[PDB]
Amino acid sequence: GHKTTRRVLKERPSRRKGAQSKRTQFVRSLIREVAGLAPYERRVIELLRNGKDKRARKFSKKKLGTFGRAKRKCEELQRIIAESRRAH
Amino acid sequence: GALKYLEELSKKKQSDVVRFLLRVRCWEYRQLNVIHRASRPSRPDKARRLGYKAKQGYVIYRVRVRRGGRQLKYQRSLRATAEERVGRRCSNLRVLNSYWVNQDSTYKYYEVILVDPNHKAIRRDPRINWICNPVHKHRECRGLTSTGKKSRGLNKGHRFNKTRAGRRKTWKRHNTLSLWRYR
Amino acid sequence: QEFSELNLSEKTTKAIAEMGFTKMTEIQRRAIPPALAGKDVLGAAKTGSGKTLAFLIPAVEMLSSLRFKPRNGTGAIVVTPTRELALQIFGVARELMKYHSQTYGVVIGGANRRAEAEKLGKGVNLLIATPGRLLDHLQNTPFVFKNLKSLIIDEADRILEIGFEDEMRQIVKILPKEDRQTMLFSATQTTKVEDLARISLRPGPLYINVDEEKKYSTVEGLEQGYVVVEADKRFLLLFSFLKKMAKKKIIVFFSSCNSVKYYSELLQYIDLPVLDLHGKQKQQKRTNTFFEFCNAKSGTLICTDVAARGLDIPQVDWIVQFDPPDDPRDYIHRVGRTARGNNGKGRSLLFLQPCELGFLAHLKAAKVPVVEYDFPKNKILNVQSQLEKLISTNYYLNQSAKEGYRSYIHAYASHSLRSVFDVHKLDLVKVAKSFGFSTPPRVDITLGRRAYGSQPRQGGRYK
RNA sequence: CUAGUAACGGCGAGUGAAGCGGCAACAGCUCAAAUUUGAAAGCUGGCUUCGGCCCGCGUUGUAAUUUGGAGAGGAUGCUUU
RNA sequence: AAGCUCCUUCGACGAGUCGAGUAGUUUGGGAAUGCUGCUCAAAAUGGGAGGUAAAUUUCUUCUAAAGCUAAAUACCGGCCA
């Protein structure tokens, strides 16, 4: 509508209120190994180690409630499988 | 330091370590009294982020609450029932906050951080002595804790139109016929 | 022609007078008057002629004449290949704007991204940048670059050699073009340099040639000595060398200015007298120090290899390359020729770790005779415990050690010969022990299938 | 004032807001997630000749610093009690 | 002790909580309007809520699950006038 000269704004410190911090990633990874897995996470990991990815995604979706949360959990457990094989 | 790790651990409550520890504690709490004094918080990260300080005048009290419906559902939260029962046992203390610590098949266990308003260590501290004022007498009975703030719908937005300033005050404001002098 | 002849501002004349420069080279005298007239400049000068002032005088004059303020963002952008060249140009620009209210700043790959983002958001009038980080800040950070009037591209042959071709293509595409004066410099003239001059500069350039035609890059009359030393003992060996080759002339080359400053303070405390040439001092101090070293019977001068690239190297007994060379071809040929000398032959020693030995294979391919220098283990003066106590107790030396360690790691990471010099093969604990640390300080070494049913995007706006 | 509007309803009885706009009044802050680590620097009590002495709480964290349209650390030079 | 400036250094933000399914209750309000009980149970360039047929969810705007705070407002009661 009306013409005004747009400004470039100062970078918001509230932007990315999640974590790009390496220390929180370190703490999250260490706790995962120390604590272990949930029973449903162990079932998903035993399906993923057998190559049954479709069943794993359906089980995760059923027990989490969203396809995005299921995808994120399946990627996390696949990453855990990858580092476990690398350590093996 | 360690509280960051404990926060991340508390975020995995079905993992082996946390599940094992929750079951052993639930067994012990089940065989204790319904409302019993806890020497220290079982979840120090959670108590610390809710305002608990290792200072004379701060008290933890664990309480078990029978879970389930009252098909009439109790519009009161189980966490609110816990704070009210503890607030009557410790009628000389002010309920600061409370948090979930455990759950069983028939009970849900909560820990309530209380504050003594007559201790000199609390009355001299400008960060907590607001609770020494008599307007904070029995905050759990008037919906003034965290559960009370959630159950009364005290949030900003179009979704909370009828409850953000009090439901009954809003209803009285909308049902009042205003007649001015010059009509 | 002298610097007082042109009608510069009185602030710029005073700053050049403090530097001590009263006479120009050919490239300054032939580039500054046309560039002050607003004409784009194509150059053929090499490193060390004095091209830095040749592109910094018109930028400073433009920034002062248009009365730029920190709320106006970038007015002039100087793109450099490496971070140490950018820091040298930043030191020169800091000396040039001593009386100018305009701001100046450096943006280099390997530094804090968030601190650089805040620096760019507050407003940097003259921006000396590295292409990858400049493109990253131009694309993902909010800062004002709409008032750009000068784009200087410096040493374009090296930037096209490293592989920043597509980065500069996107940089020229992003940057505003209307009323922008472009000045591009390169010591050679390739097809990629011609392509860059075609996309960047306007249809009418001005082509200026200041270059020696008698380059003596013969591959037979040379002899390069090397010493194989592990990382954690490297400095110790140098210290022993610099205490055993006393009463002699030694030039030592380091990769960064920060490590030169750290080792200068370190050798001041560890009672070994040296002379320092780093880009954090006054130009007058540096010229007087180099003049004093050039007219001395003995002594050792420590400096950066890129800082002494444009320096008349005198007759010295030893030329030591302590850090990896930035330009290995230039190092071998030209620095070996200046090490051999006009009279009785000096020697050019190179410090090699036992993970960069493939350089020797390169010396096998270029047919350059090599000489291996070994050292006894018992003749190394062990001052490691004193060094660690000094680093642990002195806060200024701890800061300097951390800065030198970070600068060494980042300069090693941004290396042209990544096969010979790879940061991933470096043991950080040992090199930090060489810098004087019990534990290595934290640094960033780095700094399938397509989707099912996904067809390429054909519309929409993404910011 | 919006406005008996939107919305919902044996779409009947009816029920029934909110943003903007004008005004009254206006005021902003405290923590948790940091190692004081070259020094628990913090606090409740008791004894007092009232000036400073003891026991205890507390390191599973009491002071200071910081609270994300922020902040810290160094450097820097002015300005404040 | 404090404010500001600068930057080749850093920048931790609340979980049986969001959310999914389901039963009540409530609202003008099935993006369930909000709340509660049961079952399952998250994330980290994350999360929430909106805008948009516009070519793919482009864009916009805020940070929940910790806390304090006067004034304008109400008033069949209290001390009076």
Coordinates of N, CA and C in Angstrom, one line a residue, chain B residues 14-92:
Chain B
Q14 N 11.2 -42.8 31.0 CA 11.0 -44.3 30.8 C 12.3 -45.0 30.5
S15 N 13.5 -44.2 30.5 CA 14.8 -44.9 30.3 C 15.1 -45.7 31.6
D16 N 16.1 -46.6 31.4 CA 16.3 -47.7 32.4 C 16.7 -47.1 33.8
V17 N 17.6 -46.2 33.8 CA 18.0 -45.6 35.1 C 16.8 -44.9 35.8
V18 N 16.1 -44.0 35.1 CA 15.0 -43.3 35.7 C 13.8 -44.2 36.0
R19 N 13.5 -45.1 35.2 CA 12.5 -46.1 35.5 C 12.8 -46.9 36.7
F20 N 14.0 -47.4 36.8 CA 14.4 -48.2 38.0 C 14.3 -47.3 39.3
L21 N 14.8 -46.1 39.2 CA 14.8 -45.3 40.4 C 13.4 -44.9 40.8
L22 N 12.6 -44.6 39.8 CA 11.2 -44.2 40.1 C 10.4 -45.4 40.8
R23 N 10.6 -46.6 40.3 CA 9.9 -47.8 40.9 C 10.3 -48.0 42.3
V24 N 11.6 -48.0 42.6 CA 12.2 -48.2 44.0 C 11.6 -47.1 44.9
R25 N 11.6 -45.9 44.5 CA 11.1 -44.8 45.3 C 9.6 -44.9 45.6
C26 N 8.9 -45.2 44.5 CA 7.4 -45.4 44.6 C 7.1 -46.5 45.7
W27 N 7.8 -47.6 45.7 CA 7.6 -48.6 46.7 C 7.8 -48.0 48.1
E28 N 8.9 -47.3 48.3 CA 9.2 -46.7 49.7 C 8.1 -45.7 50.0
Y29 N 7.7 -44.8 49.1 CA 6.7 -43.7 49.4 C 5.4 -44.4 49.7
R30 N 5.0 -45.4 49.0 CA 3.7 -46.1 49.2 C 3.7 -46.6 50.7
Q31 N 4.8 -47.1 51.2 CA 4.8 -47.6 52.6 C 5.0 -46.5 53.7
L32 N 5.1 -45.3 53.3 CA 5.2 -44.2 54.2 C 3.9 -43.5 54.5
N33 N 3.8 -42.4 55.2 CA 2.6 -41.7 55.4 C 2.1 -41.0 54.2
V34 N 0.8 -40.7 54.2 CA 0.2 -40.0 53.0 C 1.0 -38.6 52.8
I35 N 1.0 -37.8 53.8 CA 1.7 -36.5 53.8 C 2.9 -36.6 54.7
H36 N 4.1 -36.7 54.2 CA 5.3 -36.9 55.0 C 6.4 -35.9 54.7
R37 N 7.2 -35.4 55.7 CA 8.3 -34.4 55.4 C 9.4 -35.1 54.7
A38 N 9.9 -34.4 53.6 CA 11.0 -34.9 52.8 C 12.3 -34.1 53.3
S39 N 13.3 -34.8 53.7 CA 14.6 -34.1 54.1 C 15.1 -33.2 53.0
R40 N 15.2 -33.8 51.8 CA 15.8 -33.0 50.7 C 14.9 -33.3 49.4
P41 N 14.9 -32.4 48.4 CA 14.2 -32.8 47.2 C 14.7 -34.0 46.4
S42 N 13.9 -34.9 45.9 CA 14.3 -36.0 45.2 C 14.7 -35.5 43.8
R43 N 14.1 -34.4 43.3 CA 14.4 -33.8 42.0 C 15.0 -32.4 42.3
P44 N 16.3 -32.2 42.6 CA 16.8 -30.9 43.0 C 16.8 -29.9 41.9
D45 N 17.0 -30.3 40.6 CA 16.9 -29.4 39.4 C 15.5 -28.8 39.4
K46 N 14.5 -29.7 39.5 CA 13.1 -29.2 39.4 C 12.7 -28.3 40.6
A47 N 13.1 -28.7 41.8 CA 12.9 -27.8 43.0 C 13.6 -26.5 42.9
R48 N 14.9 -26.5 42.4 CA 15.7 -25.3 42.3 C 15.1 -24.4 41.2
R49 N 14.6 -24.9 40.1 CA 14.0 -24.0 39.1 C 12.6 -23.5 39.5
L50 N 12.0 -24.0 40.6 CA 10.7 -23.6 41.1 C 10.9 -22.7 42.3
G51 N 12.1 -22.4 42.7 CA 12.4 -21.4 43.8 C 12.8 -22.0 45.1
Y52 N 13.1 -23.3 45.2 CA 13.5 -23.9 46.4 C 15.0 -23.6 46.7
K53 N 15.3 -23.2 47.9 CA 16.7 -22.8 48.3 C 17.1 -23.6 49.5
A54 N 18.3 -24.1 49.6 CA 18.8 -24.9 50.8 C 19.1 -23.9 51.9
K55 N 18.1 -23.4 52.5 CA 18.1 -22.3 53.5 C 17.1 -22.6 54.5
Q56 N 17.3 -22.2 55.8 CA 16.4 -22.5 56.9 C 15.1 -21.7 56.6
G57 N 14.0 -22.4 56.6 CA 12.7 -21.8 56.2 C 12.1 -22.4 55.0
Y58 N 12.8 -23.3 54.3 CA 12.4 -24.0 53.2 C 12.2 -25.5 53.5
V59 N 11.0 -26.0 53.1 CA 10.6 -27.4 53.5 C 10.0 -28.1 52.3
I60 N 10.4 -29.4 52.1 CA 9.7 -30.2 51.1 C 8.7 -31.1 51.8
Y61 N 7.6 -31.3 51.2 CA 6.6 -32.3 51.7 C 6.0 -33.1 50.6
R62 N 6.3 -34.4 50.7 CA 5.8 -35.4 49.7 C 4.4 -35.8 50.0
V63 N 3.5 -35.9 49.0 CA 2.1 -36.2 49.3 C 1.6 -37.2 48.2
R64 N 0.8 -38.2 48.5 CA 0.2 -39.1 47.5 C -1.3 -38.7 47.3
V65 N -1.7 -38.7 46.1 CA -3.2 -38.3 45.8 C -3.8 -39.4 44.9
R66 N -4.9 -40.0 45.4 CA -5.6 -41.0 44.6 C -6.0 -40.5 43.3
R67 N -5.6 -41.2 42.2 CA -5.8 -40.8 40.9 C -7.1 -41.4 40.3
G68 N -7.7 -40.7 39.3 CA -8.9 -41.1 38.6 C -9.9 -40.0 38.7
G69 N -11.1 -40.4 38.2 CA -12.2 -39.4 38.2 C -12.9 -39.3 39.5
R70 N -13.8 -38.3 39.6 CA -14.5 -38.0 40.8 C -15.8 -38.9 40.9
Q71 N -19.7 -40.2 35.3 CA -18.6 -39.7 34.5 C -18.2 -38.3 34.8
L72 N -18.6 -37.8 36.0 CA -18.4 -36.4 36.4 C -16.9 -36.3 36.7
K73 N -16.2 -35.5 35.9 CA -14.7 -35.3 36.2 C -14.5 -34.2 37.1
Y74 N -13.6 -34.4 38.1 CA -13.2 -33.3 39.0 C -12.5 -32.2 38.3
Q75 N -13.1 -31.0 38.2 CA -12.4 -29.9 37.5 C -11.2 -29.4 38.3
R76 N -11.0 -29.9 39.5 CA -9.8 -29.6 40.3 C -8.7 -30.6 39.9
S77 N -7.5 -30.1 39.7 CA -6.3 -30.9 39.3 C -5.8 -31.7 40.5
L78 N -5.3 -32.9 40.3 CA -4.7 -33.7 41.4 C -3.6 -33.0 42.1
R79 N -2.8 -32.2 41.3 CA -1.7 -31.4 41.9 C -2.2 -30.3 42.8
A80 N -3.4 -29.7 42.5 CA -4.0 -28.7 43.4 C -4.5 -29.4 44.7
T81 N -5.0 -30.6 44.6 CA -5.5 -31.4 45.8 C -4.3 -31.6 46.7
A82 N -3.1 -32.0 46.1 CA -1.9 -32.2 46.9 C -1.5 -31.0 47.7
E83 N -1.4 -29.8 47.1 CA -1.0 -28.6 47.8 C -2.0 -28.2 48.9
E84 N -3.3 -28.4 48.7 CA -4.3 -28.1 49.7 C -4.1 -29.0 50.9
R85 N -3.9 -30.3 50.7 CA -3.8 -31.2 51.9 C -2.5 -30.9 52.7
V86 N -1.4 -30.6 52.0 CA -0.1 -30.2 52.6 C -0.3 -28.9 53.3
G87 N -1.0 -27.9 52.7 CA -1.2 -26.6 53.3 C -2.0 -26.6 54.6
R88 N -2.9 -27.6 54.7 CA -3.6 -27.8 56.0 C -2.8 -28.4 57.1
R89 N -2.0 -29.4 56.7 CA -1.0 -30.0 57.7 C 0.0 -29.0 58.2
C90 N 0.5 -28.2 57.3 CA 1.5 -27.1 57.6 C 0.8 -25.8 57.5
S91 N -0.1 -25.5 58.5 CA -0.9 -24.3 58.4 C -0.1 -23.0 58.7
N92 N 1.1 -23.2 59.2 CA 2.0 -22.1 59.5 C 2.9 -21.7 58.3

